[PDB]
Amino acid sequence: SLLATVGPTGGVKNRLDIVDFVRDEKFFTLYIRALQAIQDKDQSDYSSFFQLSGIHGLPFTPWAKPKDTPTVPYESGYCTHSQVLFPTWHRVYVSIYEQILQEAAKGIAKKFTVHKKEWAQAAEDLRQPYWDTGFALVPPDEIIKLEQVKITNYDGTKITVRNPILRYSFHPIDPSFNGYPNFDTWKTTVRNPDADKKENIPALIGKLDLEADSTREKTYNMLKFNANWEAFSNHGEFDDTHANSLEAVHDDIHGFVGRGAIRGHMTHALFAAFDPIFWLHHSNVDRHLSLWQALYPGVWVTQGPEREGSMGFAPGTELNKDSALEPFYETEDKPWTSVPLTDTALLNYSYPDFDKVKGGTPDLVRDYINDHIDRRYGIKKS
Ligand SMILES: [Cu+]
Ligand SMILES: [Cu+]
Ligand code: NA
């Protein structure tokens, strides 16, 4: 790899709930600045928003690969779907994003004229916030509605700049979008589009509000009831025995956001990553994995075939815990694997759900987290 996925820096910090995250002046300002920074980078820059999101689906090109690397076994996206590697591949996927996103936030923290240390420390603690869809499906206005958002300027004064969280603006629309009727002319990413291809946020807020109750119940059953890895990892082939998987419950959020009258970006695996809200989603999807690990310790990746097909594995290939997770590398010559990814500390992150039980026995944690899930996703509306 040209850019190994080593994760963020500054020790093990928590990925905050977006509801709390937006209330944090330093974190929110750094996120809005850094996110705009990587969105404005050249799309041929590997550490740019485009190439980072491009890893998931289109374009079908290698990411941060050496000059004389062997041809990829399959021309398609990188993301692993309908297979046993879904949870682990996406865990390290958010890691490279969070890593690159912090790196931009460091340069941002140097532009501040006052409190240079505190801005430097905030960047060090900066992590990808998660969207708790199971407890609060309707996100904050900063994420879904506010065209302009309040941040702190480099002099300390409060200003309002355009919100980079709502949508990404292609520059240009990559030549690999040509064949697809609606996404080739769409200048920016779109959520819940109408028949006239116009974005419809109001209808989206309405959709989420109604799907809220069912989403909490789906999330509850997913977290608590999954002994074997096969039924928990993937959904394929959208059957009943996988309906309670981490991915199946994960699919509903892509549909809610992307699927309107016509299909938007979030409801298409080849374009879903380009929507900025994609990362808040899969940060929470990763939190589910962390919570599930607390309930089902010892259970991890089991063997399974590549059914859909990705640029890492051709259809029919056998996959296990020792399978390489392209294009994510521990070092220059060592690809990531599922085995070590049980410990998020290796990527310098964690979730606030575990704060009151740090350094506790697996038994105490399993009881604390279980009560946590029951109390949060096992009760009535919020
Ligand atoms: Cu994916
Ligand atoms: Cu997804
Ligand atoms: Na790609």
Residue numbers in the entry: 2 to 383
Give verbatim excerpts from the published study on this entry.
Tyrosinases, bifunctional metalloenzymes, catalyze the oxidation of monophenols and o-diphenols to o-quinones, the precursor compounds of the brown-coloured pigment melanin. Evidently, the function of the C-terminal domain is not restricted to a shutter function but it may also act as molecular machinery to incorporate copper ions into the active site. Isoform abPPO4 was isolated and extensively purified from the natural source (Agaricus bisporus), which contains a total of six polyphenol oxidases (PPOs).
The protein crystallized in space group C2 as a crystallo­graphic heterodimer composed of one polypeptide chain of L-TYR (Ser2–Thr556) and one chain of A-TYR (Ser2–Ser383) as well as two half POM discs ([TeW6O24]6−). The polyoxoanion [TeW6O24]6− with the Anderson–Evans-type structure was deliberately used as a cocrystallization agent to obtain single crystals suitable for X-ray diffraction. The crystal structure of mushroom tyrosinase abPPO4 was solved by combining molecular replacement (MR) and single-wavelength anomalous dispersion (SAD), benefiting from the anomalous scattering signal of the tungsten provided by the cocrystallized POM. The crystal structure of abPPO4 described here with a crystallographic heterodimeric constitution allows a direct comparison between the two active sites of a latent (zymogen) tyrosinase (L-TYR) and its proteolytically activated form (A-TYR). Hence, the CuA site seems to be fixed irrespective of whether or not the C-terminal domain is present. This would result in a somewhat flexible CuB site. The residue Phe454 acts as the substrate placeholder, pointing directly towards CuB at a distance of 4.3 Å (C∊2–CuB). Thus, each polyoxoanion is bound by a total of eight amino acids from two equivalent monomers (A-TYR abPPO4 or L-TYR abPPO4).
